[PDB]
Amino acid sequence: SKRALVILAKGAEEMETVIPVDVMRRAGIKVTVAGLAGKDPVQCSRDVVICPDASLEDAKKEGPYDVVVLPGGNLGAQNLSESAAVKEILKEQENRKGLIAAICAGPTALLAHEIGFGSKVTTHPLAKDKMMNGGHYTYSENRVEKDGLILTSRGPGTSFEFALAIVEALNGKEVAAQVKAPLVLK
Amino acid sequence: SKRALVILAKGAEEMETVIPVDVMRRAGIKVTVAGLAGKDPVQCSRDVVICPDASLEDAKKEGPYDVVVLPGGNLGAQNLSESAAVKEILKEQENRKGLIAAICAGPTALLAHEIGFGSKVTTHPLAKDKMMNGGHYTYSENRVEKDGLILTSRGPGTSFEFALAIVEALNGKEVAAQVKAPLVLK
């Protein structure tokens, strides 16, 4: 019965969007794919076009959520970083001690909105310098990093591990294992 | 300068659709996401809604393609299997000695359209019995199987390997390696 908000902006990495949405839904999580710009289709980084379930405006009214998920993609992450709406959502989630998950360049939106300073985090290797500007976080090379309520991951190739980490945090290890088996992961 | 046709039907596994599209585009392949039913958005197996680049009807007119890709998802694969349009596309691709790639339950569409009989193939473990009805193929447990112009794979967790195998077949090992590195795969 847990709920997840996935914030989808133009230029988001489509694999880092779809893998967590899919895997979370396999885990019985109620996932809302929310369009940052509105209800209209979103053109992702490699031109896959995804239709969000709702606008971020409407999705927020149906909160709170057990996890707020920020996909990567440099341009997508930048759009998340410049959004006042995202700032408010993340600050509220932080204030209520709710999980926040971000992957690849996604964690740089946490920096932009001053979220989770003092946490151990990882990012895509190419996003490290951006994330570490000011030394507000401690960097990790782990494929998935979880420091309390801040969960981060590195890239498309860590998206399954990232998604399963979210499932484990919300529904437990048993459910994560059950969901993992049919995926045919290495 | 290679070209790929990805046939997207209702109930397709969205991860097995997006990962190959994304990875192939990273490799400089011109990818066309073609909607089986038309130009309208496609509701995938876990409710991700993707807008195709064009209808399959229009996409065919812009052929031939260096690879025809069939995503999995049981209901998606069934829709592919029941389509006369898909039958024609696959038979033409086979006749011109062009690559055909299918993942998870996707290969069962090859069976339905009598494509590549005598080939070594793999599928999702749960799709094996369906695929092997009549013993027209030889089964493999390899995560990716390639027997000449028939390339198959097992599931969401083998989608990156599947995609990179397609890249290697079209653009070579060097390009595949270059595309792989930034993905942060295990």
PDB file of C-alpha atoms in Angstrom, chain B residues 40-172:
ATOM      1  CA  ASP B  40      -1.634   6.812 -30.736  1.00  0.00           C
ATOM      2  CA  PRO B  41       0.088   6.375 -27.347  1.00  0.00           C
ATOM      3  CA  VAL B  42       0.745   2.797 -26.226  1.00  0.00           C
ATOM      4  CA  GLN B  43      -0.101   1.535 -22.736  1.00  0.00           C
ATOM      5  CA  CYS B  44       2.699  -0.846 -21.734  1.00  0.00           C
ATOM      6  CA  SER B  45       2.533  -3.830 -19.341  1.00  0.00           C
ATOM      7  CA  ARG B  46       3.253  -1.792 -16.173  1.00  0.00           C
ATOM      8  CA  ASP B  47       1.126   1.154 -17.393  1.00  0.00           C
ATOM      9  CA  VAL B  48       3.955   3.351 -18.694  1.00  0.00           C
ATOM     10  CA  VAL B  49       2.484   5.176 -21.699  1.00  0.00           C
ATOM     11  CA  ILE B  50       4.832   5.717 -24.650  1.00  0.00           C
ATOM     12  CA  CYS B  51       4.131   7.815 -27.756  1.00  0.00           C
ATOM     13  CA  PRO B  52       5.476   6.070 -30.879  1.00  0.00           C
ATOM     14  CA  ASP B  53       7.467   7.979 -33.515  1.00  0.00           C
ATOM     15  CA  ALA B  54       5.106   6.726 -36.211  1.00  0.00           C
ATOM     16  CA  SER B  55       2.576   4.031 -37.074  1.00  0.00           C
ATOM     17  CA  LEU B  56       3.895   0.642 -38.201  1.00  0.00           C
ATOM     18  CA  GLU B  57       2.140   1.261 -41.529  1.00  0.00           C
ATOM     19  CA  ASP B  58       4.150   4.441 -42.187  1.00  0.00           C
ATOM     20  CA  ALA B  59       7.360   3.045 -40.655  1.00  0.00           C
ATOM     21  CA  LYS B  60       7.318   0.111 -43.100  1.00  0.00           C
ATOM     22  CA  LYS B  61       7.264   2.521 -46.066  1.00  0.00           C
ATOM     23  CA  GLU B  62      10.570   3.974 -44.814  1.00  0.00           C
ATOM     24  CA  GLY B  63      12.283   0.555 -44.703  1.00  0.00           C
ATOM     25  CA  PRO B  64      14.135  -1.666 -44.987  1.00  0.00           C
ATOM     26  CA  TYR B  65      15.812  -1.691 -41.570  1.00  0.00           C
ATOM     27  CA  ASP B  66      19.107  -3.231 -40.466  1.00  0.00           C
ATOM     28  CA  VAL B  67      17.302  -4.719 -37.465  1.00  0.00           C
ATOM     29  CA  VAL B  68      13.687  -5.376 -36.475  1.00  0.00           C
ATOM     30  CA  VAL B  69      13.305  -5.449 -32.685  1.00  0.00           C
ATOM     31  CA  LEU B  70      10.470  -7.207 -30.834  1.00  0.00           C
ATOM     32  CA  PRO B  71      10.125  -6.276 -27.155  1.00  0.00           C
ATOM     33  CA  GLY B  72       8.630  -8.754 -24.695  1.00  0.00           C
ATOM     34  CA  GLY B  73       5.701  -8.589 -22.307  1.00  0.00           C
ATOM     35  CA  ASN B  74       3.235 -11.457 -22.689  1.00  0.00           C
ATOM     36  CA  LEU B  75       0.302  -9.362 -23.940  1.00  0.00           C
ATOM     37  CA  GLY B  76       2.555  -7.287 -26.207  1.00  0.00           C
ATOM     38  CA  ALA B  77       4.103 -10.431 -27.677  1.00  0.00           C
ATOM     39  CA  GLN B  78       0.621 -11.868 -28.255  1.00  0.00           C
ATOM     40  CA  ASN B  79      -0.416  -8.724 -30.137  1.00  0.00           C
ATOM     41  CA  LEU B  80       2.738  -9.013 -32.279  1.00  0.00           C
ATOM     42  CA  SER B  81       1.965 -12.710 -32.874  1.00  0.00           C
ATOM     43  CA  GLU B  82      -1.587 -11.992 -34.104  1.00  0.00           C
ATOM     44  CA  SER B  83      -0.578  -9.172 -36.471  1.00  0.00           C
ATOM     45  CA  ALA B  84      -0.553  -9.821 -40.222  1.00  0.00           C
ATOM     46  CA  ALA B  85       1.516  -6.632 -40.614  1.00  0.00           C
ATOM     47  CA  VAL B  86       4.220  -7.977 -38.283  1.00  0.00           C
ATOM     48  CA  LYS B  87       4.188 -11.316 -40.138  1.00  0.00           C
ATOM     49  CA  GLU B  88       4.898  -9.528 -43.419  1.00  0.00           C
ATOM     50  CA  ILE B  89       7.647  -7.344 -41.921  1.00  0.00           C
ATOM     51  CA  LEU B  90       9.428 -10.312 -40.319  1.00  0.00           C
ATOM     52  CA  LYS B  91       9.168 -12.519 -43.418  1.00  0.00           C
ATOM     53  CA  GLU B  92      10.555  -9.699 -45.579  1.00  0.00           C
ATOM     54  CA  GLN B  93      13.405  -9.105 -43.111  1.00  0.00           C
ATOM     55  CA  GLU B  94      14.193 -12.832 -43.080  1.00  0.00           C
ATOM     56  CA  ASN B  95      14.087 -12.976 -46.900  1.00  0.00           C
ATOM     57  CA  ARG B  96      16.560 -10.078 -47.273  1.00  0.00           C
ATOM     58  CA  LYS B  97      18.896 -11.643 -44.663  1.00  0.00           C
ATOM     59  CA  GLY B  98      18.350  -8.827 -42.160  1.00  0.00           C
ATOM     60  CA  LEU B  99      18.791  -9.114 -38.394  1.00  0.00           C
ATOM     61  CA  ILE B 100      15.783  -9.850 -36.180  1.00  0.00           C
ATOM     62  CA  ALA B 101      16.059  -9.327 -32.418  1.00  0.00           C
ATOM     63  CA  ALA B 102      13.498 -10.428 -29.803  1.00  0.00           C
ATOM     64  CA  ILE B 103      13.531 -10.455 -25.981  1.00  0.00           C
ATOM     65  CA  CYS B 104      11.601 -12.194 -23.146  1.00  0.00           C
ATOM     66  CA  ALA B 105       8.266 -13.333 -24.604  1.00  0.00           C
ATOM     67  CA  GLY B 106       9.068 -11.492 -27.855  1.00  0.00           C
ATOM     68  CA  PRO B 107      10.602 -14.580 -29.494  1.00  0.00           C
ATOM     69  CA  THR B 108       7.206 -16.355 -29.340  1.00  0.00           C
ATOM     70  CA  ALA B 109       6.126 -13.960 -32.122  1.00  0.00           C
ATOM     71  CA  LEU B 110       8.844 -15.569 -34.271  1.00  0.00           C
ATOM     72  CA  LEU B 111       7.194 -18.946 -33.643  1.00  0.00           C
ATOM     73  CA  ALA B 112       3.741 -17.561 -34.510  1.00  0.00           C
ATOM     74  CA  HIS B 113       5.036 -16.203 -37.837  1.00  0.00           C
ATOM     75  CA  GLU B 114       7.257 -19.252 -38.560  1.00  0.00           C
ATOM     76  CA  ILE B 115      10.451 -17.167 -38.490  1.00  0.00           C
ATOM     77  CA  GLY B 116      13.952 -18.605 -38.094  1.00  0.00           C
ATOM     78  CA  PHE B 117      13.020 -22.258 -37.525  1.00  0.00           C
ATOM     79  CA  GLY B 118      16.140 -24.332 -36.822  1.00  0.00           C
ATOM     80  CA  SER B 119      17.811 -21.522 -34.850  1.00  0.00           C
ATOM     81  CA  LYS B 120      19.170 -21.654 -31.324  1.00  0.00           C
ATOM     82  CA  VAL B 121      17.066 -19.286 -29.210  1.00  0.00           C
ATOM     83  CA  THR B 122      16.429 -18.174 -25.660  1.00  0.00           C
ATOM     84  CA  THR B 123      13.386 -16.618 -24.008  1.00  0.00           C
ATOM     85  CA  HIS B 124      12.185 -15.732 -20.549  1.00  0.00           C
ATOM     86  CA  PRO B 125      12.157 -18.999 -18.564  1.00  0.00           C
ATOM     87  CA  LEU B 126       8.335 -18.789 -18.295  1.00  0.00           C
ATOM     88  CA  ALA B 127       8.034 -18.466 -22.108  1.00  0.00           C
ATOM     89  CA  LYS B 128      10.168 -21.548 -22.900  1.00  0.00           C
ATOM     90  CA  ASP B 129       7.324 -24.065 -23.209  1.00  0.00           C
ATOM     91  CA  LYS B 130       5.395 -21.778 -25.576  1.00  0.00           C
ATOM     92  CA  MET B 131       8.475 -21.138 -27.723  1.00  0.00           C
ATOM     93  CA  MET B 132       9.378 -24.842 -27.875  1.00  0.00           C
ATOM     94  CA  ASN B 133       5.926 -26.055 -28.955  1.00  0.00           C
ATOM     95  CA  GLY B 134       6.702 -28.357 -31.891  1.00  0.00           C
ATOM     96  CA  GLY B 135      10.476 -28.332 -31.337  1.00  0.00           C
ATOM     97  CA  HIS B 136      11.110 -25.869 -34.176  1.00  0.00           C
ATOM     98  CA  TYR B 137      13.980 -24.198 -32.305  1.00  0.00           C
ATOM     99  CA  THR B 138      16.771 -25.398 -30.034  1.00  0.00           C
ATOM    100  CA  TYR B 139      16.626 -23.845 -26.575  1.00  0.00           C
ATOM    101  CA  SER B 140      19.450 -21.953 -24.879  1.00  0.00           C
ATOM    102  CA  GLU B 141      19.845 -20.597 -21.342  1.00  0.00           C
ATOM    103  CA  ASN B 142      22.395 -17.970 -22.411  1.00  0.00           C
ATOM    104  CA  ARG B 143      21.390 -14.463 -21.326  1.00  0.00           C
ATOM    105  CA  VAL B 144      21.782 -13.381 -24.952  1.00  0.00           C
ATOM    106  CA  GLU B 145      21.674 -15.895 -27.804  1.00  0.00           C
ATOM    107  CA  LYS B 146      22.712 -15.112 -31.373  1.00  0.00           C
ATOM    108  CA  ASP B 147      22.413 -17.740 -34.089  1.00  0.00           C
ATOM    109  CA  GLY B 148      23.247 -15.824 -37.258  1.00  0.00           C
ATOM    110  CA  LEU B 149      20.444 -13.359 -38.017  1.00  0.00           C
ATOM    111  CA  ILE B 150      18.214 -14.406 -35.086  1.00  0.00           C
ATOM    112  CA  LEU B 151      19.172 -12.639 -31.847  1.00  0.00           C
ATOM    113  CA  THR B 152      17.230 -13.400 -28.655  1.00  0.00           C
ATOM    114  CA  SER B 153      17.371 -12.591 -24.929  1.00  0.00           C
ATOM    115  CA  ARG B 154      15.632 -13.486 -21.662  1.00  0.00           C
ATOM    116  CA  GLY B 155      14.116 -10.542 -19.754  1.00  0.00           C
ATOM    117  CA  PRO B 156      14.236  -7.016 -18.341  1.00  0.00           C
ATOM    118  CA  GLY B 157      17.491  -7.860 -16.542  1.00  0.00           C
ATOM    119  CA  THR B 158      19.137  -8.888 -19.843  1.00  0.00           C
ATOM    120  CA  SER B 159      17.888  -5.833 -21.791  1.00  0.00           C
ATOM    121  CA  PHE B 160      21.230  -3.973 -21.658  1.00  0.00           C
ATOM    122  CA  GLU B 161      23.142  -7.060 -22.845  1.00  0.00           C
ATOM    123  CA  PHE B 162      20.484  -7.565 -25.548  1.00  0.00           C
ATOM    124  CA  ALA B 163      20.755  -3.941 -26.683  1.00  0.00           C
ATOM    125  CA  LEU B 164      24.568  -3.989 -26.702  1.00  0.00           C
ATOM    126  CA  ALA B 165      24.518  -7.233 -28.712  1.00  0.00           C
ATOM    127  CA  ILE B 166      22.403  -5.442 -31.338  1.00  0.00           C
ATOM    128  CA  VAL B 167      24.840  -2.516 -31.321  1.00  0.00           C
ATOM    129  CA  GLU B 168      27.796  -4.895 -31.766  1.00  0.00           C
ATOM    130  CA  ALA B 169      26.089  -6.694 -34.667  1.00  0.00           C
ATOM    131  CA  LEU B 170      25.328  -3.399 -36.466  1.00  0.00           C
ATOM    132  CA  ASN B 171      28.197  -1.039 -35.554  1.00  0.00           C
ATOM    133  CA  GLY B 172      30.911  -3.380 -34.199  1.00  0.00           C
TER     134      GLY B 172
END
